[PDB]
Design a protein around this ligand. Structure first.
Ligand code: KDG
Length: 310
């Protein structure tokens, strides 16, 4: 009804042909359809508008309208978001969907407006897997001394240092070059990102560790969103609901497709045995306990309880 022409900028870090990049184009299509072509979303993928930290700041200030980012960089504004960098929180994607779409996920999204952001909903980045260029990693012992890029918060740094890595926080947009030049030995990310950001080309080793699950938050600038009419807000939130469903499906198919592609493209795949997984859990347990104070005890306990019920 009350919809005026709008042009809406949507930058992101992943490649345009990643599952989430394709979901961003899907969001653009749905926004156009629901607005009779009046609201036009322009996507800028592959880091064209900067990494997550810059995208977040652009939404706060108003130079950008929409983005998706990992939860990890949000921890520098809202420490409770660091909960998702704890290892082995979610047994599988069904547990993740339930927790994130339920009250514990909502409690965290509800903290965003005070920082100038609207958490429209959660999208799936996914289960993270270790890659490197030094040696196969199939044992906890093999992590020792690996120079491993991590996401930029205290939880990620502390977890990987606790596992023996030389952990190097770096923005995602600098990662391919750091791997290619061997400024770092490795990194960790979902399979479809390892594929579509081309990290595999410079990472002969992959471990199916699935050690952490990363949500994306699908974000709007609060300053911008608040100036929309209710009908315009409804286009955005309806398109966000449609796109979340599309994105999670595309992500899960993308993960299966990525493992097949990586094996065909000269990547050597390992895993941690059940005994090595046990060693990792035992090693990180005291680190996780100490990190509760930095994240927020009630957030950690609430998320763990929600995951158990799920
Ligand atoms: O920083 C990482 O490794 C991530 O998993 C991805 C980033 O959030 C990326 O900017 C998403 O577009």
């Amino acid at each position: 009804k009350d919809i005026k022409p709008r042009i809406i900028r949507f930058g992101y870090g992943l490649a345009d042909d990643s599952p989430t990049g394709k979901a961003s184009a899907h969001f653009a299509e749905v926004v156009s359809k629901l607005s009779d072509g009046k609201m036009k979303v322009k996507t800028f993928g592959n880091g064209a508008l900067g990494p997550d930290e810059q995208l977040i700041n652009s939404l706060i200030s108003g130079s950008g309208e929409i983005t998706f980012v990992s939860t990890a960089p949000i921890a520098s504004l809202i420490p409770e978001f660091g909960v998702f960098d704890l290892p082995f929180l979610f047994d599988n994607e069904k547990v993740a969907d339930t927790v994130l779409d339920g009250p514990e996920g909502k409690k965290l999204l509800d903290k965003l407006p005070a920082k100038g952001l609207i958490g429209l909903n959660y999208w799936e980045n996914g289960f993270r897997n270790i890659t490197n260029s030094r040696h196969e990693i199939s044992k906890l012992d093999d992590i020792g001394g690996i120079k491993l890029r991590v996401m930029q918060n205290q939880v990620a740094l502390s977890v990987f240092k606790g596992l023996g890595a030389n952990a190097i926080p770096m923005p995602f947009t600098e990662l391919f070059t750091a791997l290619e030049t061997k400024t770092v030995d490795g990194q960790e990310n979902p399979l479809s990102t390892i594929q579509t950001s081309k990290f595999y080309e410079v990472q002969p080793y992959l471990t199916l560790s699935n050690h952490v699950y990363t949500p994306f938050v699908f974000l709007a600038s609060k300053k911008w969103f608040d100036q929309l009419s209710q009908d315009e807000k409804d286009v955005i939130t309806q398109a966000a609901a449609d796109s979340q469903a599309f994105q999670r499906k595309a992500s899960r198919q993308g993960n299966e497709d990525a493992l097949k592609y990586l094996k065909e493209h000269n990547v050597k795949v390992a895993e941690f045995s059940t005994e090595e997984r046990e060693k990792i859990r035992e090693k990180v347990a005291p680190i996780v306990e100490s990190l509760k104070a930095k994240i927020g005890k009630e957030t950690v306990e609430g998320v763990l309880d929600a995951a158990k019920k799920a």
